[PDB]
Design an enzyme around this catalytic site. Structure first.
Site, PDB file in Angstrom:
ATOM      1  N   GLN A 122       0.802  -1.215   0.000  1.00 62.82           N
ATOM      2  CA  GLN A 122       0.000   0.000   0.000  1.00 62.82           C
ATOM      3  C   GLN A 122       0.839   1.271   0.000  1.00 62.82           C
ATOM      4  OE1 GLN A 122      -2.822   0.154   3.213  1.00 62.82           O
ATOM      5  NE2 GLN A 122      -4.100   1.721   2.239  1.00 62.82           N
ATOM      6  N   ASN A 141       3.596   5.352  12.799  1.00 60.93           N
ATOM      7  CA  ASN A 141       2.374   5.873  12.193  1.00 60.93           C
ATOM      8  C   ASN A 141       1.753   6.993  13.020  1.00 60.93           C
ATOM      9  OD1 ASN A 141       2.334   4.423   9.826  1.00 60.93           O
ATOM     10  ND2 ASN A 141       0.331   3.482  10.204  1.00 60.93           N
ATOM     11  N   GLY A 197       5.205  -9.209   6.959  1.00 57.19           N
ATOM     12  CA  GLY A 197       6.315  -8.294   7.155  1.00 57.19           C
ATOM     13  C   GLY A 197       7.285  -8.714   8.240  1.00 57.19           C
ATOM     14  N   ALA A 243      -0.731 -14.946   7.064  1.00 54.75           N
ATOM     15  CA  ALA A 243      -0.071 -15.355   8.296  1.00 54.75           C
ATOM     16  C   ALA A 243      -0.897 -15.040   9.532  1.00 54.75           C
ATOM     17  CB  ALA A 243       1.300 -14.685   8.409  1.00 54.75           C
ATOM     18  N   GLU A 249      26.862   5.935  -0.087  1.00 50.30           N
ATOM     19  CA  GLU A 249      27.505   7.025   0.642  1.00 50.30           C
ATOM     20  C   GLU A 249      27.008   7.128   2.080  1.00 50.30           C
ATOM     21  OE1 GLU A 249      27.702  10.887  -0.947  1.00 50.30           O
ATOM     22  OE2 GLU A 249      28.852  10.342  -2.734  1.00 50.30           O
ATOM     23  N   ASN A 258       1.016   7.545   2.820  1.00 49.02           N
ATOM     24  CA  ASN A 258       1.926   6.904   1.878  1.00 49.02           C
ATOM     25  C   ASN A 258       2.461   7.898   0.856  1.00 49.02           C
ATOM     26  OD1 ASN A 258       0.761   4.898   3.364  1.00 49.02           O
ATOM     27  ND2 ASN A 258      -0.170   3.823   1.629  1.00 49.02           N
ATOM     28  N   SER A 270       6.904  -4.212   7.367  1.00 51.83           N
ATOM     29  CA  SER A 270       6.204  -3.783   8.568  1.00 51.83           C
ATOM     30  C   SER A 270       6.517  -4.727   9.721  1.00 51.83           C
ATOM     31  CB  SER A 270       4.693  -3.737   8.337  1.00 51.83           C
ATOM     32  OG  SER A 270       4.164  -5.044   8.204  1.00 51.83           O
TER      33      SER A 270
END
Ligand SMILES: Nc1nc2c(ncn2[C@@H]2O[C@H](COP(=O)(O)OP(=O)(O)OP(=O)(O)O)[C@@H](O)[C@H]2O)c(=O)[nH]1
Ligand SMILES: Nc1nc2c(ncn2[C@@H]2O[C@H](COP(=O)(O)OP(=O)(O)O)[C@@H](O)[C@H]2O)c(=O)[nH]1
Ligand SMILES: Nc1nc2c(ncn2[C@@H]2O[C@H](COP(=O)(O)OP(=O)(O)O)[C@@H](O)[C@H]2O)c(=O)[nH]1
Ligand SMILES: [Mg+2]
Lengths: 439, 193, 426, 48, 48, 426
Positions: free
Chosen positions: A15, A206, A146, A99, A254, A228, A140
């Protein structure tokens, strides 16, 4: 000659990656069909799209990312929405069963059956590009995919490609609000993988985005569809120097050496400024000093900590827009004057700048204003140990009654990893206090 | 433009660029070719882009198969000075090629002569929509340049009918070129054409 | 004829050498096409010193353009003067270093050094009587400092009886644009002081001081900063290219400025710098030029000569004039500032004059001076290194690529012995 | 205050050193005059 | 530190001024010697 | 040849000097662009005294322009003759002194004098043979009275063998434009009497009286009062830059008008002054000039000279004109007004004759004069200071910046000694 590859994991990743790639379409002028507009009959204006978009003899540009999630429902909106013809039919990996907010389901039992399918396309996107710096990971902490699937993805990627760079943008759990209950289990048990199998890892909270979007842009009640955009505005200012010309260019290699002083210390922090509305834009003048002061201000800080309680180790300036280097030096010499901002005594030069010429673009219907200059922070500070301390205290009192253990033990993994993940962190927090101790 | 301020004011002030022009301003793209003496290595088609913001010209050459040269970019978002010289001690502000580019105008960029040959469809739509700036896109003036020779307008019908052998409404662009240059008026420019 | 071979390494070296090859193309009358468009004929009598001759009356620069990332190579080739540089003169890599001296000096720079030798040895052997080398690089970068120091040691092992001068970019006390530059710079100057004949220390913040104060400009872009660097680069080899009353090469300046093989750090300056409003009211006169020389504002290094004292001074003059006030006024500033010069050697100041001034100017002069005040630059990077190394900071980027800790201690110990003998001649 | 006093006194010290050098130069020049007219004394003694 | 530097520089300035005064005193003393032997020159010229 | 450095401080000093640099530019025929457009060559032989040569024939004035408030320098550049001043000679601060001698001397005017001293010293070494200093300010303000007397102190301790010619606009009782200026007047004459050799007292009531009864103009703006002052500015030294038959410089005026180290307060004059409507009915003759130099109406100080006795008087004449009429009438005014001059010194009058009169006139005469009637000028400031310090009013603005109250007692003590010596010798 330069290319970049992005891997977005979980419902958060797929998303934020939608808003990440619509901006990438708008900086290079790519229409949602996937080409230059047919009004323009001659193209190839500049090869800045070669690093984010592929090339086909019919004139179509295909992105160089892969989306992975175990939930088909949020994936197929990309197949159904406006950008269906732009994204590749294969570059969006779909699971069958989620999951379900767990670590063991995403890691040991369901993450195995799709870890080989993505790696085929990762290898396929690796031999397309002649020169690859590394991989960006948009995952996440609280998600099942995630956490569990990523904890096997970074492990297998480290032996698939040895010295390749590994950047992570992690959706860290907010210290006050959360959408789940077992997220300390999903957060701690993936840290054992990420501390050794990652190079750099920026954290995003968030609820700090919630207050910043409310009090600065004057928009009450935001939505993920504009957060987002803000995160996607951060990703463009990092890769701006790779694509676009500037006074001095910063590579993806760098700042990975200039923000990680120790292998166990690889947790910097992101901050973006200015963040103002269109109505507020024209009244207030936007000087380089007035946009770099809000960056060091903890009110505009994007992870819920305080550098006043902590101390910096490194920083990174990403200047993009109408900027001249004279007042950049006057600003950073002024930053070194305030004693409210405290640095460590062993890193007396904690600055790296990056200059880009083109000012940032804006999207139709977006919240940010048409701005001429901006600056992004990538700063490493020890104030994350304040956030880690209140995360483990919640973890320890939750584990003291052995709650939710049966959701993990019966999946196949042993219960010894619970004690090891708590202890390995405890050594890490000991490492965090020791670097903060001066001589 | 940075050093004007030493005599504009005793204490200098930063130069202020056009916020208004940057705010309203897309990209005007022209097809160009290289013009020097007869050399066999130089048959290269370039594309010139005028950005209409900061008044800036960028020239690029697309990569061509089995060519001995591969030049991705010729200039990088930099303004162009006309060949009039007078580099030092110029009392006035310097001259810069403004946005006056037709089809057929040979532009001298950095000592390299570039002949403009075609425009993109967006560019030609801009040409026909904005005409106070460009009198060469007026249909009315284009036909007024042809109305000066009404004596030969009767003969032109048999000239067209000689080419129309199959009784069709169907002629070539090269034919419609060669009658309009066989008029020998000399005033039919390529943009009007 | 004595021809100069130019070396150009790094991103910073590319941005200053692009301006360097612009002004001498402007001075010699070289259009961006590649031909010659000028008025006189004495600009062409010695043009092989920087330009190689080819068919069609064309001249290409006698330079090698070296970098590890290829992003700035498209930057060089598409600039205002991008079509004069030879396409085969570009040497590029694929995996960039990214502000790390260790990758640039042992792993990434170990393969591209052989390919760029084959470029430079092919080019250098084609010169008839090669005068020497010159170099532009930055100490704070992975490519210019990591691999350019490999080139410094390697061409010194291959061409012993030559002269090589470096326009080195030292860090600034406040402007510092890296976190790990003591690791990037202190090991570079360990390899630099052994294998260099002349070193010009060019600092960015001094250019910011010149443009804001002396020239009174408000937006000093890097194109504006690099002209000042490139002005003194062309200003040292003027007598090499043009006739005068008393000529001077880089060899002639070296034998008068460095008395010992480890005292070769200079402090450049440029005289005709005047602000625009003050251009019409200031009389361009030889005492006015030498007045703006020895002022500490004008200097291009972040050092104060009042804190130290001079050892040798060089002045290279341009423009048809009398030698009287160059001779008289340098004796006056030698006599007025009795405490600002060493006393164990007389006549410390060297004179050079050239007939042709640069374009749009009547007289000009260049300052080259050895001083003990550059120890303040070395001690400032010494305390930054000492306050970083003791707790093994940023070390896994350096000890994980092969080199041991004894290299780091010798990098200190060579440097502390260098500033030990800097103190003794003070 | 201490820095201003130190700079002023240092400038006066440099001026005093320069004046001492000038006094030494006068001493040398008019010592040469003294030797010249001492030789004149010897010449007039030979005249007597 | 600034106080110590200022006092040392003041002592050096006093030393330089004292040396200048001594040099001027030597100037005056052998000015007197010069005029005395000039009178001597006049006396032996009268003898001649 | 004999260069004079002009210093301008305060708002009053800036306006008068802007008028002063206009008159001598008109006298020497210099247009506001910076070139020279004249008819006679005698205006070009002696040009280095007031103006400095620059390349292209452009002449620039040797002057220093100093004020903390930058309000007046915008008007100076916007004036008719403002393009000629150098922008390097525009030295300014950030905040005004606020009519305070404390802020103008020790807090805000204490760090700008470093910048003023470097411009002054740079222009001092540019001169061939320096002749002295002339300065203009106001005693009744904060910047002019503060930094003016500060700059008098700092230059006198660095250039001892020179002269100072101060043109001070002393306040008047009825034209009192401030309420605190008794403090600033007493605290500046302490620094004036010890470090100046020649001081010219100018008043506003005297100038308003002259423009009413002598010139007969009903709108006497500041653009006219400064013109009357600027006439004496250009007439005091007209024998330094023009030929004549009996030349006299500023040092000759100093040794002919200052008998004692403390009696050096003068009173100026200029007397070919006529109205526009009475030009036709007056004979421009040496007797008529001599008549109107010496009356009390023409003095530019608010003092009656007949209440005291002159000590020394000097007159500078301009024009092709005789000498017996000068010597007889200067003797005649001494014999007729024998009670108006002291009897213990003979020949109180000094005469100087030049060749070139100013533009739009036939002959000129500039009057300067030492007199003991300045007792009435300083007695009023005494009574103002004593009645004001008695209740310690207007004092927290002074003790809040570093100065003790004892300096107020010392300033009254010095000035009481100054009115003691004039009354003793009257
Ligand atoms: N900032 C931001 N966070 C998001 C977004 N979408 C999801 N998240 C975060 O993701 C968390 C929920 O976990 P998910 O990502 O939905 O779970 P998952 O990765 O799909 O794993 P499973 O649910 O087991 O399939 C929430 O707490 C959010 O904080 C987004 O668009 N922006
Ligand atoms: N004076 C000057 N310095 C520059 C310029 N460009 C870059 N730099 C300096 O060079 C440093 C970065 O060098 P870097 O690009 O990492 O060198 P590289 O890795 O060897 O190519 C920065 O600290 C800049 O201050 C320039 O045009 N002029
Ligand atoms: N005659 C005359 N007096 C002036 C002129 N300009 C200012 N003044 C006097 O200056 C006094 C004010 O001085 P001020 O500007 O406050 O001094 P500063 O604050 O130190 O600069 C007033 O009393 C005026 O009478 C002028 O052009 N002509
Ligand atoms: Mg999922």
């Amino acid at each position: 000659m330069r290319e970049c590859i992005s891997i977005h994991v979980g419902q958060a990743g797929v998303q934020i990656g939608n808003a990440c790639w619509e901006l990438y379409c708008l900086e290079h002028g790519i229409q949602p069909d996937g080409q230059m507009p047919s009004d323009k009959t001659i193209g190839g204006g500049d090869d800045s799209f070669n690093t984010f978009f592929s090339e086909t003899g019919a004139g179509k540009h295909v992105p160089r990312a892969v989306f992975v999630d175990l939930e088909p429902t949020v994936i197929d909106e990309v197949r159904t929405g406006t950008y269906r013809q732009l994204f590749h039919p294969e570059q969006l990996i779909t699971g069958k069963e989620d999951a379900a907010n767990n670590y063991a389901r995403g890691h040991y039992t369901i993450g195995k059956e799709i870890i080989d399918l993505v790696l085929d396309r990762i290898r396929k996107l690796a031999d397309q590009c002649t020169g690859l710096q590394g991989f960006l990971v948009f995952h996440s902490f609280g998600g099942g995919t995630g956490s569990g699937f990523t904890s096997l993805l970074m492990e297998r990627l480290s032996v698939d490609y040895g010295k390749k760079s590994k950047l992570e943008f992690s959706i860290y759990p907010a210290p006050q609000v959360s959408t789940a209950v077992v997220e300390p289990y999903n957060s701690i048990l993936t840290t054992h993988t990420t501390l050794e199998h990652s190079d750099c890892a920026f954290m995003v909270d968030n609820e700090a985005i919630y207050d910043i979007c409310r009090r600065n842009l004057d928009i009450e009640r935001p939505t993920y569809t504009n957060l987002n955009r803000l995160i996607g505005q951060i990703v463009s200012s990092i890769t701006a120097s790779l694509r676009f010309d500037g006074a001095l260019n910063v590579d993806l290699t760098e700042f990975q050496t200039n923000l990680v002083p120790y292998p166990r210390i690889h947790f910097p922090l992101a901050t973006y400024a200015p963040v103002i509305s269109a109505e507020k834009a024209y009244h207030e003048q936007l000087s380089v000093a007035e946009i770099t002061n809000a960056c060091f201000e903890p009110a505009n800080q994007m992870v819920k900590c305080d550098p006043r309680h902590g101390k910096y180790m490194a920083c990174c300036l990403l200047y993009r827009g109408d900027v001249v280097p004279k007042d950049v030096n006057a600003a950073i010499a002024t930053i070194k004057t305030k004693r409210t901002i405290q640095f460590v005594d062993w890193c007396p030069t904690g600055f790296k700048v990056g200059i880009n010429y083109q000012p940032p673009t804006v999207v139709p219907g977006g919240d940010l204003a048409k701005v001429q200059r901006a600056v992004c922070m990538l700063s490493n500070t020890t104030a994350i140990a304040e956030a880690w301390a209140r995360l483990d205290h919640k973890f320890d009192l939750m584990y003291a009654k052995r709650a939710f253990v049966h959701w993990y033990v019966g999946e196949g993994m042993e219960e010894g990893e619970f004690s090891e993940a708590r202890e390995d962190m405890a050594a890490l927090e000991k490492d965090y206090e020791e670097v903060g101790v001066d001589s | 433009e940075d050093s004007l301020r030493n005599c504009i004011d005793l204490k200098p002030t930063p130069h202020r660029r056009n916020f208004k022009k940057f705010m309203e301003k897309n990209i005007l793209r022209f097809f160009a070719k290289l013009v020097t003496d007869k050399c066999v290595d130089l048959d290269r088609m370039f594309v010139i882009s005028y950005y209409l913001g900061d008044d800036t010209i960028s020239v690029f050459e697309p990569i061509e198969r089995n060519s001995g040269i591969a030049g991705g970019m010729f200039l990088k978002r930099s303004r162009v000075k006309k060949p009039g010289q007078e580099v030092f001690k110029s009392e006035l502000s310097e001259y810069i090629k403004a946005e006056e580019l037709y089809i057929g105008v040979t532009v001298n960029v950095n000592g390299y002569l570039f002949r403009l040959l075609n425009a993109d469809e967006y560019t030609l739509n801009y040409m026909e929509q904005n005409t106070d700036k460009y009198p060469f896109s007026n249909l009315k003036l284009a036909l007024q340049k042809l109305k000066q020779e009404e004596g030969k307008s009767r003969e032109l019908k048999q000239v067209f009918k000689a080419a129309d052998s199959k009784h069709t409404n169907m002629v070539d662009y090269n034919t419609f070129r060669d009658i309009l240059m066989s008029l020998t008026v000399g005033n039919l420019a390529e943009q009007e054409f | 004829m004595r021809e100069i071979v130019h070396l150009q390494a790094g991103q910073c070296g590319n941005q200053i050498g692009a301006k360097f090859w612009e002004v001498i193309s402007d001075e010699h009358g070289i259009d961006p096409t590649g031909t010659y468009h000028g008025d006189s004929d004495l600009q062409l009598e010695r043009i092989n010193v920087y330009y190689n001759e080819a068919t069609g009356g064309k001249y290409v620069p006698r330079a090698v353009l070296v970098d590890l990332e290829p992003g700035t190579m498209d930057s060089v080739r598409s600039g205002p003067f991008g079509q004069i540089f030879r396409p085969d003169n570009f040497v590029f890599g694929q995996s960039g270093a990214g502000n790390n001296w260790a990758k640039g000096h042992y792993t990434e720079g170990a393969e591209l050094v052989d390919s760029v030798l084959d470029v430079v040895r092919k080019e250098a052997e084609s010169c008839d009587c090669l005068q020497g080398f010159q170099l532009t690089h930055s100490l704070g970068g992975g490519t210019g400092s990591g691999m350019g120091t490999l080139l410094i040691s390697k061409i010194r092992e291959e061409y012993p009886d030559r002269i090589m001068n470096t326009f080195s970019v030292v860090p600034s006390p406040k402007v510092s644009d890296t976190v790990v530059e003591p690791y990037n710079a202190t090991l570079s100057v360990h390899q630099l002081v052994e294998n260099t004949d002349e070193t010009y220390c060019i600092d960015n913040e001094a250019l910011y001081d010149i443009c804001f104060r002396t020239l009174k400009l408000t937006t000093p872009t890097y194109g504006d900063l690099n002209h000042l660097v490139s002005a003194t680069m062309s200003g040292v080899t003027t007598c090499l290219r043009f006739p005068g009353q008393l000529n001077a090469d880089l060899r002639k300046l070296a034998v008068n400025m460095v008395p010992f093989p480890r005292l070769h750090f200079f402090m450049p300056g440029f005289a005709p710098l005047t602000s625009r409003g003050s251009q019409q009211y200031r009389a361009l006169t030889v005492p006015e030029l030498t007045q703006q020389m020895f002022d500490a504002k004008n200097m291009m290094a972040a050092c104060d000569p009042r804190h130290g004292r001079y050892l040798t001074v060089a002045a290279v003059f341009r423009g048809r004039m009398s030698m009287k006030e160059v001779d008289e006024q340098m004796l006056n500033v030698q006599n007025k500032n009795s405490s600002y010069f060493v006393e164990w050697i007389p006549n410390n100041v060297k004179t050079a004059v050239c007939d042709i001034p640069p374009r749009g100017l009547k007289m000009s002069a260049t300052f080259i001076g050895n001083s003990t005040a550059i120890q303040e630059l070395f001690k400032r990077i010494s305390e930054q290194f000492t306050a970083m190394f003791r707790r093994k900071a940023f070390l896994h980027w350096y000890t994980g690529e092969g080199m041991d800790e004894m290299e780091f201690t010798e990098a200190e110990s060579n440097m502390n012995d260098l500033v030990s003998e800097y103190q003794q001649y003070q | 205050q201490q820095q201003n006093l130190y700079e002023a006194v240092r400038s006066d010290r440099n001026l005093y050193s320069k004046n001492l050098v000038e006094a030494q130069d006068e001493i040398t020049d008019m010592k040469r005059k003294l030797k010249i007219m001492i030789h004149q004394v010897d010449e007039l003694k030979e005249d007597i």
